[PDB]
Amino acid sequence: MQNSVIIVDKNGRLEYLVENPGGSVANSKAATVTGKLVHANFGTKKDFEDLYTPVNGSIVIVRAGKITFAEKVANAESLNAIGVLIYMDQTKFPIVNAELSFTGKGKSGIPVQTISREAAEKLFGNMEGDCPSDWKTDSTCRMVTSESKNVKLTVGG
């Protein structure tokens, strides 16, 4: 279903293909979105409450775990995020059979994509701000993209 995660420079001339994930998120809306990438830990409600950066109008990246993918997306949707990236921090191997179950059996309101940990680590290289020690995640974790960088998420259909 031809998915792609791309870091685009705000000068409009440079971009860097992070990953074209072979796996698709079942019931994700098919679209392309571009904006800031904000790390929201696991995407739980408390994670979003303790977040400094407003996710409204931004792509959020979350770790798999604690809650379903649908609940992560539903919280990001509620806070007016434009897209969601999901990755596992405990393995390099990609998420398989990623799935979104919503009331009414419909799709997400925003594009949702699973990415490998290597892909997440690449995004973190273009991101600033150490993640809180309380998250108990890899030292490569970063919070928000630098001002000169946006993430272009494309989920195909």
Contact positions toward Na ion, by CB under 5 A? Answer: 36, 67-68, 71, 145
Task: Report the distance separating Cα 31 and Cα 28, nearest Å.
Answer: 9
Widest CA span in the chain:
42
Closer to Na ion by CB, 52 or 133: give it: 52
Task: Report the distance separating Cα 96 and Cα 24, nearest Å.
Answer: 9
The nearest distance, CB 92 to Na ion, in angstroms, is 25
Closer to Na ion by CB, 110 or 127: give it: 127
The radius of gyration of the chain's CA atoms, rounded to the nearest angstrom, is: 14
Label residues 40-79 b or e (16+ Cβ within 10 Å = b). bbbbbeebbeebeeebeebbbbbbbeebebbbbbbbbbeb
Closer to Na ion by CB, 51 or 67: give it: 67
Whole-Å CA distances, 63 to 69, 84, 104, 147, 157: 10, 11, 25, 23, 24
Closer to Na ion by CB, 41 or 145: give it: 145
The nearest distance, CB 57 to Na ion, in angstroms, is 11
Closer to Na ion by CB, 58 or 154: give it: 58
The nearest distance, CB 99 to Na ion, in angstroms, is 12
The nearest distance, CB 145 to Na ion, in angstroms, is 4
The nearest distance, CB 15 to Na ion, in angstroms, is 14
